[PDB]
Design a protein around this ligand. Structure first.
Ligand SMILES: Nc1nc2c(ncn2[C@H]2C[C@H](O)[C@@H](COP(=O)(O)OP(=O)(O)OP(=O)(O)O)O2)c(=O)[nH]1
Ligand SMILES: OC[C@H]1O[C@@](CO)(O[C@H]2O[C@H](CO)[C@@H](O)[C@H](O)[C@H]2O)[C@@H](O)[C@@H]1O
Ligand SMILES: [Mg+2]
Lengths: 551, 407
């Protein structure tokens, strides 16, 4: 290609790589004098000599052609010594973001990286040695004149070059959509097939002038088109077949593979869950460690298989219609969603199941799912959808009025798909008449690891419980636990733990802490609870009595 | 055709490397047309990936000006850029701005587009326009000119700006002009109509060489208030004692011993307690101490400003601006008037813009905000409501209300 090279440098103070080749067989090094001779004839590489002090090992894998080989160079050292780049690939195109087109073509560039020249001054650093005769002779060595596969600068420089080469055609044909992912070009248009093929031929000639071939073997003309791991039909798109592993004995690595495949499937298969399977990965120590599936993990896997054996498809985007995102709750902090425009015709699906923070509730997690969907929708379609959420307007209103942090959800309507999202309790804003008043306190000794938790009440009741292997905050939470345990359906509670008040006042319904979980249980079972704070060690009311009692 | 000023980063610091966040269709289209026109006019140049730096870019739309305005978030670059109080190119802030009856803000960033930028610094100004559904890789540009939002632009353009404002400030000695980043804050004491008229004349002068209305007189301070009742419960006195106990960290000579003495014994929260003569004495005294401003708190221009905000509900937001803890330079209460009353994130964003604006008028710089919001909630929506050409520093906090001090 006559494209102008891109100047690249090594990091300051750094020099080139000086490593050695592997394994030196006459089959291997005769294959290495076999592969390169054609690249040298075409000008991709050039022979070099001992006055070049650098070296890097080379190898090759098999392409998905399964007959052609792919030449790779282990440039990890050179990459470590090469300047940083700003990557221009910001994300991955999705078929749900495509619009229906009358005529579609998919093209691939042949030997893409090898068609882009490398900066002259940099070429000396790409030197690779092939032993002449198993180290019995100086040795044959080459250097790259084009972008190597394995150098960290090659993909960005190729992408930039391809963008510059495509820009004229894009500006001249605004009514032709060209999705450009590496050397893979999707080309859609609303032209009749004849003039469409005319414009395709023009595009291929433009690419060829700049040295980018488009072999017919990788030129798709009729549906279904194979594109980015999907199959594109005129009216719908499908994922390419997903094959789940089937094992009698499962290792950590097998489960990791399975969860990954299920996540990939969740983009179009509705209702996928991976919580129980992922829990098996926790606490493990080796990738080859055998992990027996729990009962819950077996059930979750079976449900996923049932989902996956049913055929599904997504549809394409209609910009003259609204985007709609509907969310359902699945339990244990798992959420699934569908994005569509016409009912029962999903553009795509997805799921949200991250645990953010030690203590949270379903309203916060629903807000998080809404935010994930909003970001994804802006990426794919450039706008935010309208939401259908299983939460009452009264519940949301109560939450965002009582909660102290600013929060919001865009335009949404209530959809009655149980289980609904709800607040599981609400602390009273005023003290409760006729309810017992508990002054609670807990304290721990940091060097000793011993503590105590207790309460004093206005009705004359008092209690102190010893605690071992605890902390300060844990003793405070423990005092609240005692008060909730020994009180009736309605209770007033007074603590000096800004920490515990902080956790409980956020109305969490789940927690990574067993103690906080127990407190949540007790709060859900209560009828009315007023919780108040006072400063400690100021000799206040019953707080001084309980603080004296614990000590 | 002017010689550039050599500028460098602070020692041991590298350029910004901040990722571009997703943008809606309208913002992307606006940025594409704006950057295309700027590219034809030579203000920016297309660059490749061998430039390893990046700064996020987006666009805003003022309500009174339906044209899109490009906004590059150069906060990181500004933090890494050399200071200009060593090159003596700093801007002094006039103390008379906050006394004026009306202050209009004007966007004068376009002036910066007439002065070239140091050839060896331009690489630090790179930014990337994204693509809907990642149809294409991002499109990268860098500045050849003093960029909008870069802290070095007002410093380098200072001499020019003074030369352009000299006749207007000569014909109007009692109007105050203060330049902050890309903005001119223009204060006067005269009536509304003639104020807007003189603003028009100022505009035509600037336009010839190359309307947001504030009222600082209406900015009041909201102090710590104590409730006033006739009968008091145990709970009322517990909350009062806790509130005053916190307030003893800010004010001087605040007592609690008698009001606290009322609570002796393990008493029911709802039980009514009569106020001792001595306790009423204590409440009146403490109530008076909170009435007058705290003595001994002065602005220090060598230290940064910090702003805390608390949501109070029903569209009310309290805030405090300080430099050292508990030594508040200002306490206030923001309230929206849009009528809709149903968006916390919008109200908080507007509150940040108003507080930072007051900090610019009063002290000449914005404070670092401690925002009572989750990071991801703020980042999901805040650009939809931003209207300023500057962006303040902020961080995210989650502190529930122990006592409700400021309400
Ligand atoms: N270092 C490295 N680069 C890859 C790999 N797979 C693809 N690429 C890069 C280099 C390729 O030139 C470019 C386009 O991928 P292709 O599958 O089309 O390979 P290529 O165009 O070189 O040969 P082709 O004529 O299409 O069979 O993307 C890989 O596994 N390792
Ligand atoms: O909202 C914070 C978020 O913004 C980023 C860039 O998007 O950093 C910007 O905001 C920070 C907070 O003031 C600044 O410190 C920084 O200089 C500015 O670029 C992210 O770093 C951060 O997650
Ligand atoms: Mg190819």
């Amino acid at each position: 290609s006559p494209i102008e090279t891109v100047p690249v440098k090594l990091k300051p103070g750094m020099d080139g790589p000086k490593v050695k080749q592997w394994p030196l067989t006459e089959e291997k090094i005769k294959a290495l004098v076999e592969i390169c001779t054609e690249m040298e004839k075409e000008g991709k590489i050039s022979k070099i000599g001992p006055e070049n002090p650098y070296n890097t090992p080379v190898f090759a894998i098999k392409k998905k052609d399964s007959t052609k080989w792919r030449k790779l160079v282990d440039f990890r050292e050179l990459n470590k010594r090469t300047q940083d780049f700003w990557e221009v690939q910001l994300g991955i195109p999705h078929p749900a973001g495509l619009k229906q087109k009358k005529s579609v073509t998919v093209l691939d560039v042949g030997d893409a990286y090898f068609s882009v020249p490398l900066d002259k001054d940099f070429r000396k650093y790409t030197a690779f040695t092939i032993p002449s005769i198993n180290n019995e002779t100086p040795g044959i060595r080459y250097q790259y004149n084009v972008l190597p596969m394995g150098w960290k600068g090659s993909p960005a420089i190729f992408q930039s070059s391809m963008t510059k080469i495509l820009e004229p055609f894009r500006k001249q044909n605004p009514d032709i959509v060209i999705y450009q992912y590496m050397d893979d070009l999707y080309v859609g248009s609303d032209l009749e097939i004849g003039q469409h093929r005319t414009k395709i031929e023009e595009l291929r000639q433009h690419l060829l002038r700049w040295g980018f071939t488009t072999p017919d073997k990788k030129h798709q003309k009729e549906p279904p088109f194979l594109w980015m791991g999907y199959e594109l039909h005129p009216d719908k798109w499908t994922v390419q077949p997903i094959v789940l592993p089937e094992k009698d004995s499962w290792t950590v690595n097998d489960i990791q593979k399975l969860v990954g495949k299920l996540n990939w499937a969740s983009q179009i298969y509705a209702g996928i869950k991976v919580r129980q399977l992922s829990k098996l990965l926790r606490g493990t120590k080796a990738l080859t460690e055998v992990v027996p599936l729990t009962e819950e993990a077996e059930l979750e896997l079976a449900e996923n298989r049932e989902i996956l054996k049913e055929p599904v498809h997504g549809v394409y985007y209609d910009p003259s219609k609204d985007l709609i995102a509907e969310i359902q709750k699945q339990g244990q902090g798992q959420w699934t969603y569908q994005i569509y425009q016409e009912p029962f015709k999903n553009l795509k699906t997805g799921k949200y199941a991250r645990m953010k923070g030690a203590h949270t509730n379903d309203v916060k997690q629903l807000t998080e799912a809404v935010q994930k969907i909003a970001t994804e929708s802006i990426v794919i379609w450039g706008k935010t959808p309208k939401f259908k959420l299983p939460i009452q307007k009264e519940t949301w209103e109560a939450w965002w009025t009582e909660y102290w942090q600013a929060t919001w959800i865009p335009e949404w309507e209530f959809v009655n798909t149980p289980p609904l999202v709800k607040l599981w309790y609400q602390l009273e804003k005023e003290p409760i008449i006729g309810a017992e008043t508990f002054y609670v306190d807990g304290a721990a000794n940091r060097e000793t690891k011993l503590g105590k938790a207790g309460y004093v009440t206005d009705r004359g009741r008092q209690k102190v419980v010893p605690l071992t292997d605890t902390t300060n905050q844990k003793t405070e939470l423990q005092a609240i636990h005692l008060a909730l345990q020994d009180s009736g359906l309605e209770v007033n509670i007074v603590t000096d733990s800004q920490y515990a008040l902080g956790i409980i006042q956020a109305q969490p319904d789940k927690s990574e802490s067993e103690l906080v979980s127990q407190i949540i249980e007790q709060l859900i079972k209560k009828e009315k609870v007023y919780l108040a704070w006072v400063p400690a060690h100021k000799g206040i009311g019953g707080n001084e009595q309980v603080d004296k009692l614990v000590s | 055709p002017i010689e550039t000023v050599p500028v460098k980063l602070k020692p041991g610091m590298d350029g910004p490397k901040v990722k571009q966040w997703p943008l809606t269709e309208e913002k992307i289209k606006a940025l594409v047309e704006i950057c295309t026109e700027m590219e034809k006019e030579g203000k920016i140049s297309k660059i490749g990936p061998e430039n390893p730096y990046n700064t996020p870019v987006f666009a805003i739309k003022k309500k009174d000006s339906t044209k899109w305005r490009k906004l590059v978030d150069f906060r990181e670059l500004n933090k890494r850029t050399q200071d200009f109080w060593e090159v003596q190119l700093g801007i002094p802030h006039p103390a008379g701005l906050k006394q004026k009856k009306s202050v209009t803000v004007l966007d004068v960033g376009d002036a910066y587009f007439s002065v070239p930028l140091d050839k060896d610094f331009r690489k630090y100004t790179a930014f990337t326009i994204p693509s809907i559904n990642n149809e294409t890789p991002g499109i990268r540009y860098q500045y050849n000119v003093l960029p909008q939002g870069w802290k070095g632009s007002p410093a380098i353009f200072q001499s020019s700006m003074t030369k352009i404002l000299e006749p207007f400030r000569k014909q109007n000695p009692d109007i105050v002009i203060y330049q902050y980043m890309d903005d001119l804050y223009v204060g006067s004491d005269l009536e509304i109509g003639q104020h807007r008229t003189k603003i028009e004349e100022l505009r035509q002068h600037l336009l010839r060489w190359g309307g947001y209305e504030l009222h600082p007189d209406k900015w009041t301070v909201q102090p710590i208030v104590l409730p006033e009742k006739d009968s008091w419960t145990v709970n009322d006195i517990q909350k009062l004692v806790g509130k005053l106990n916190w307030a003893s960290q800010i004010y001087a000579g605040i007592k609690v011993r008698q009001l606290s003495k009322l609570l002796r014994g393990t008493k029911a929260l709802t039980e009514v307690v009569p106020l001792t003569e001595e306790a009423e004495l204590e409440l009146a005294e403490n109530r008076e101490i909170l009435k007058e401003p705290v003595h001994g708190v002065y602005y220090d221009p060598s230290k940064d400003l910090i702003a805390e905000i608390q949501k109070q509900g029903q569209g009310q937001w309290t805030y405090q601006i300080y430099q050292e803890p508990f030594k508040n330079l200002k306490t206030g209460k923001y309230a929206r008037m849009k009528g809709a009353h149903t968006n916390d994130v919008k109200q908080l964003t507007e509150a940040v813009q108003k507080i930072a604006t007051e900090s610019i008028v009063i002290w000449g710089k914005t404070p670092k905000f401690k925002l009572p919001i989750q990071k991801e909630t703020w980042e999901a929506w805040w650009t939809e409501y931003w209207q300023a050409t500057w962006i303040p520093e902020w961080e995210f906090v989650n502190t529930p209300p122990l006592v409700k001090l400021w309400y």
